Design a protein around this nucleic acid. Structure first.
Ligand SMILES: Nc1ncnc2c1ncn2[C@@H]1O[C@@H]2COP(=O)(O)O[C@H]2[C@H]1O
Ligand SMILES: Nc1ncnc2c1ncn2[C@@H]1O[C@@H]2COP(=O)(O)O[C@H]2[C@H]1O
Ligand SMILES: Nc1ncnc2c1ncn2[C@@H]1O[C@@H]2COP(=O)(O)O[C@H]2[C@H]1O
Ligand SMILES: Nc1ncnc2c1ncn2[C@@H]1O[C@@H]2COP(=O)(O)O[C@H]2[C@H]1O
Lengths: 200, 200
DNA sequence: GTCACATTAAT
DNA sequence: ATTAATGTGACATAT
DNA sequence: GTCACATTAAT
DNA sequence: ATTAATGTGACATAT
């Protein structure tokens, strides 16, 4: 993309090791990010530390954009590297200037914000309409469709901790274990620790 | 605002009576809206008709924007007039042209989308971290802060059905009634049908 | 779900 | 070696 | 929460 | 008049 390589030429690339935190919730937002390589997890915490993953973001996604349209904004969530990342970065101020010379870069940003509101809205619906089992089931099918999913004779095989499934759907690690077990007894999946074969 | 009156001069104003539906979920998105007067409710439904209110939008808010950044998009939710509305409307195509002559109008749009992602994300957190009572309690305090809230010697008085509270927080009408009653026994509110006095 | 431990994976 | 995850049965309620 | 009715508000 | 909301006690489970 012509608009992207141009935008990236005004950015300073930073690398982050896996598991590090790129953005800290509560801090002043003055910088925009863009994932050149790798993936991250956007998450929020309650008053007592419980974590909920709002979304995963990968190659080609902007991050830290919510503070751009108004002064004195704080990061709305935490962002941690899921894999080692290579992230381009640029101050809001300089980005606002590129928007003036070319509004097409703001168009790329908004396209993702729109998509984010659509998917976060769908997550509101899952938390309100589906029980924990329905939410886990849907999560498993989503993961089984992803790129990093391995092929298997009876479906697709995925690797994930019960802690992270619990963080995505909103339940304890113990609850995830009990439901995985129930889905297995129904012959819908095969669970062996962190390995899950989703039949299909 | 100079940019707004200009943008609105390329829009065609339509009026809608209260309770009517401005946008239908599932339909082709080819038009952008903007509330000149009145308020609406953005909502989603499950497979069996249960409704969840994602947000209320008022004077000065854009609507129908999620389909703008990609062809063949469908409305992601339902939008109904909460009060009689006066809504400016414009095709995506013409709006895209105004964006080129002036990118500041896209800046106004994105500011709201960002704000929407922040508040919808906070709603994800409420559904995941707070029990029904906590969600109702928070809802009551929010309503008591709003413009249409009436003053009262012991706090603020609000009018709302138990059906709508249930639609905002994600519980049955019967559940709302039982929790309102419990909050009253704790002297936190005074509930007389649709009238709620939030003490504070 | 939380709790209290007992068992196991994982670096 | 230790640290990061798990597995379990008993429970107290909220949904 | 859902269910089955009995009671009441609201136009 | 009717239609739109509610109020209730008994329950079956999921959280
Ligand atoms: N619901 C969400 N989905 C995806 N990304 C999000 C979501 N909420 C916040 N973010 C991202 O996480 C970032 C946290 O800091 P900012 O608010 O600056 O910008 C935010 C977005 O880039
Ligand atoms: N409603 C919730 N109840 C419990 N844990 C939750 C909830 N929402 C998110 N979580 C998180 O998901 C995690 C799943 O594994 P843990 O039990 O280690 O810790 C849990 C919390 O950090
Ligand atoms: N979470 C949300 N908060 C606020 N407005 C929303 C939300 N989800 C959808 N909308 C609005 O409702 C509209 C439904 O149709 P569109 O998807 O075209 O555009 C959507 C937005 O204008
Ligand atoms: N999880 C949920 N359970 C029940 N009703 C819900 C839920 N989420 C949203 N709702 C809606 O909220 C409404 C509250 O009043 P009702 O019982 O008439 O109907 C309910 C549904 O339309």
């Amino acid at each position: 993309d012509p608009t992207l390589e141009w935008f990236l030429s005004h950015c300073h690339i930073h690398k982050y090791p896996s598991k590090s935190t790129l953005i800290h919730q509560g801090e002043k937002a003055e910088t925009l990010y863009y994932i050149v390589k790798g993936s991250v997890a956007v998450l929020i915490k309650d008053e007592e530390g419980k974590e909920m993953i709002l979304s995963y973001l990968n190659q080609g996604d902007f991050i830290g954009e919510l503070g751009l349209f108004e002064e004195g904004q704080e990061r709305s969530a935490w962002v941690r590297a899921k894999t080692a990342c290579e992230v381009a970065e640029i101050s809001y101020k300089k980005f606002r200037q590129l928007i003036q010379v070319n509004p097409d870069i703001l168009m790329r940003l908004s396209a993702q914000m729109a998509r984010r509101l659509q998917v976060t809205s769908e997550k509101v619906g899952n938390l309100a309409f589906l029980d924990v089992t329905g939410r886990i089931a849907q999560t498993l099918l989503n993961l089984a469709k992803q790129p990093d999913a391995m092929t298997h004779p009876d479906g697709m095989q995925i690797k994930i901790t019960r802690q992270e499934i619990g963080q995505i759907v909103g339940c304890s690690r113990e609850t995830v274990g009990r439901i995985l077990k129930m889905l297995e007894d129904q012959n819908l999946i095969s669970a062996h620790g962190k390995t899950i074969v989703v039949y299909g």
